[PDB]
Amino acid sequence: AAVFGIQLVPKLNTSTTRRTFLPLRFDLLLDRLQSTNLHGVLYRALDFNPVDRSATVIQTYPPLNAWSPHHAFIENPLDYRDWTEFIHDRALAFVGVLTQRYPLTQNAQRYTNPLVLGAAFGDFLNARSIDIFLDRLFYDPTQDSPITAITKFPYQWTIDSNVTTDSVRTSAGCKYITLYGYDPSRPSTPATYGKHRPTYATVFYYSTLPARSRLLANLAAGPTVLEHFDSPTYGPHLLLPQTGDVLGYSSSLISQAALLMVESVMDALRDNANASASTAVTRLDQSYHPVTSFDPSTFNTLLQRATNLALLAVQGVQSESAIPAIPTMSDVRSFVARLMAEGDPQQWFPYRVDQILYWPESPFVPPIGPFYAPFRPVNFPFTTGSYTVVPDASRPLRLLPQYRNATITVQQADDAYEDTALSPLITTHGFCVTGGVFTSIYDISGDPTAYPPAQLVDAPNDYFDRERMARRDLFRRLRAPRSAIKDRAVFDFLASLVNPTTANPVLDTSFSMAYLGASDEPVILADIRSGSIPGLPIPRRIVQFGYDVVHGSLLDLSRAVPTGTFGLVYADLDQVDMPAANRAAIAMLGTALQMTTAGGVSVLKVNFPTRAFWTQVFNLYATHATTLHLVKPTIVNSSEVFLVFGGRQSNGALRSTTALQRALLSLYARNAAIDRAVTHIPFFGVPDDGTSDLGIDAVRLFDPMFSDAVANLPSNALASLVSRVVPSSIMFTRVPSNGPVSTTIYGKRTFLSNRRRARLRDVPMLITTTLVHQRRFTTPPTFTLFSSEAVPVTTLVAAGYNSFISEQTRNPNLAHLLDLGTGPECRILSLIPPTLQVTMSDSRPCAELMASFDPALTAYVQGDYSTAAFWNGIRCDSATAIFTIGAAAAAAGTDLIAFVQQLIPRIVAAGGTRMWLQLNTPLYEVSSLPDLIEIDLRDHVYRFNGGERVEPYADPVPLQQAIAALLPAAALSWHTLSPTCDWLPYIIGVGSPLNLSDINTAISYSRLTPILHIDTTTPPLRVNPVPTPLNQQCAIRITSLDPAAVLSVQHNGVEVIGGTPGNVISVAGAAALQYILANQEFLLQFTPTLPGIFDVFLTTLGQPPVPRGSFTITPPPTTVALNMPPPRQLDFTDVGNDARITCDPYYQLAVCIFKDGQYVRVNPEKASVVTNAPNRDLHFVLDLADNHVLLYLCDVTPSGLGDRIAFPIVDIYRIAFPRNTPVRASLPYTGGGAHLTSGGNPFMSLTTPPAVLPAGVALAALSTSVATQYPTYTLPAGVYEYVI
């Protein structure tokens, strides 16, 4: 429950016993006073500053707390320096006065009288004669402590200790004295409570109860009279606060009378907080109590409100907000603020003037006398128990949402949100992309097919537009920062076009390089000269150019240049309003392809490869160079591609090939994907509205009373909010203002929630227990569209199906769909049109209150589908087993093929037309991922994260025929995460970072686990080769009754073959399509040049395109044979012997060594893949280092090289070095040292150059060393022993 602004945790907890009041003996009082250091023993600096012996306030204990200074001490306060000195003096000098009147030795075993001792000591400090107090400085425990003060003498004159027959009127102590330099201004200084003052109270001690009536009666005019009912300190006192009110705690001056209440009530609360059973406290409660001039009815004055809350604080109730051990003004004020805030004055325990009603069923055990009545309210909501304190959360903690039973009505659960939501919420964007590049090479000179340069995919219209550009730009900045990547990317590739041989060198060691464009000098320059980029030799000299070179002359590549040629003329200038821009580019390339040495390598960078420029380029420079590859390094969303020219020889023939059409086409196909994706993101610096798709919407509540079983606003707003952001995050925080305690509860409202929330018919409640439990302050909210780290390669794949199932389920005729093994909480409800009737099922119970969704539209079945029983009475025309099918085979400990062998037939019986199952079979390759998936071959099984989970798999072919035998008439097809990254509005759409380099990983993780899409509703394909080999003509036959259809097979999310029988444009190879009337099926005579998964599409003139199955041209047989040369005819001389390597032309091989986890391209002079049109050869130069370090021919792809084929050359690794010939001793690698030892004798050292080389040793002509940045000494003849 909650009393006014304060919230009280359910559990009641109070100390269960009271320590018998013990009066200090006379000796102990003598030691306490005469101790080395009084600090701690008598007084205690509340906030003593380490740096300097300074203390703003000092809270004091017993023989000192009684004392109340005279005016001269208040005005001109002392510093913590002379203060310790003042007391360390007076405390001692006082012991004298008192001990000389009572020799300790004889009377130490006599209890001093708490009261008199106080006044007797306080009066001593003020320097008042202390004669009278001594007379009775002791008293026998039997006679009351306050009675001895009266019995000994009824002396009604000594100021500050008027003893009458029944009462002793003395000025309250000063539990706080303030040393000069104190100010209630700072929020940090400890809450003094006005007691730093001398006369803020007037403790009236009384002898008997009738003695007390006579007191109250007489002081009934005074503002109010607080009195401690629970075991008063030295005997029943009767505190009377002076009329004045303290400054600081509330903007509205709080009366000294009411402040004392807060300060105490704030104890009974903080004390209940940690009071335990095992401990025995003085008082079962510390709360004060008003006995006079107090208005019992109203609840305005801070006092009335506080009082009202103390009658409750005596039950053991504890404040949810932890009350500090040493209340500080900032804190006290944050409590006195919470108290003032409009609320409901607790009503369980009515107020009395002489009795505190305490719950019988409560921890609190009444003292004795007549002050505690065991009143029992009709229905107290609190039960007992305590709470262990938990430290403040360092960051906003996310809260999984678990639902309750009652659900709010959309209408009410809306404004509820809109009454406390942070609408125009300012939010940071952060960075959505942080990864490297997603480079993609394309050989234009490679493809042997001519493709009319007039009809390429010309720049898409929309491209240049306020809306599109705005986004293309926005995405750009949303990338945590670029040439360092791009530039390096192009060189990672350029390193493959390097030919070391004399026959026809290309980028041969020490080649000169021209460079245009710099900001200081390009960061890549340092690396080229360092030979840092593996595979590429160190150029002799680099000549910079451009518009801001700062190290070379400034040239304008548009017009002519006055410089000489270069082996490599890497051009990176920008083109930017389209025709003259084309001229700009066509011109630039013209001069860049001019500055290159004859037989060089020009590397221009076009900004808009328009089919307008692709005619001018293939026309003007149709000769200039030999080869040509497009190297689009996608760092951000732009269409600027890089073109590299082979041999800058005058009589070349760079014809536009189908490669270009495909390359160019893939590029755009992705900008539509990347753009459509970015649409879901708000423009920087714009206040958050409801418009933005990815907008972060929160709900800040103030001291919200989340209650179970009640639709109170605070708990009502919680509903909507979580409903508006389910699949997301939902992070709740609690920052403590010196006023109330705000608690925002944001979440990244995406389009994945709008889809889900729409399907909701009602907004369910959330078990507020977890929230009610917190009670600790976390850090302030953040509101940031994106998280900070790039999602796991696994998610890039998962969010690759949530886009796929989304597009499949979006189909109308689909009707009723079920999900075999949806998550514990239906995650598929977001990926389905709010109208389709789906029925998710899972062994575990559904996480979302299935009741809130319309029964007709959403159904939920428990138990597994692996068991035959479950399938009774569940009929859906389409099933989807994504993310489960793999776990079921493992759970049911069964074979993968055998499993689906029993599931598919059940879906057929279940009445299913369509099927989608995230099966995990290696259709592309049996190759695995190092950290993501291990493919144990002894037993068909996977190891996602090697161990984390193990699930059996099937093979592309066996599983393919097994399912075709199950559903013979059904058409099968494999959909897999397409390189176009069109699924993006699911990663960048939900607000998650990523690595443009991982897209490659996931498109490779998607290949390890495709989604076999079956369709009983159509005839399946017919591939004549079956395990279709790349580069072989195959027969494919789509059986469609109407010849008037358009065949359009598309692979990778890009169409490649389209056209009615007569004409068929094919970029995948020679495709001759012709509808045969007889069989009524278009027989496609197709021969592919690219392996993959082609999804055949046969679309009728009218109506949407319809899929008719999917065949898969499998990559060629990866293997490597080398015509290794014989020991003789093979030399260790400079001219490197070369064994012709036999490998499919398809795979590009590159020599390298396996250093660490990756492959590092060996330097071209040591080894290389010199390729003649007739054959690819392995050129190598024998070095003594060859026996220790071995080389590997590796599959060079845009990805890390050498994954498909990484075979190690074990021959060049064993070639035994003779005694009759010179041999080259190089260095093993960039980080390794060596030394030669002929015949077991330290002959020489490669690591350290011998000041003077040994007889017959010199540097080689080349730098054959694998590292390319090391010398390579040639020895005479002998028996050297390389020792790395």
Binding site: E361, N379, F380, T383
Partner: protein, 41 residues
């Protein structure tokens, strides 16, 4: 039958409870609530 305490005004294992049918009060609730068209309105 473990003690509860306040959730509900009566403990089951509470002090002096008493099962004891009386032909007089046939236990219960409300099953025959009328809702038919004409009768509900």
């Amino acid at each position: 039958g473990n003690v509860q305490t306040s959730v509900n005004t009566y403990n089951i294992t509470g002090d002096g409870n008493s099962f004891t049918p009386t032909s007089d009060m046939t236990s219960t609730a409300a099953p025959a609530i009328d809702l038919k068209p004409g009768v509900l309105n």
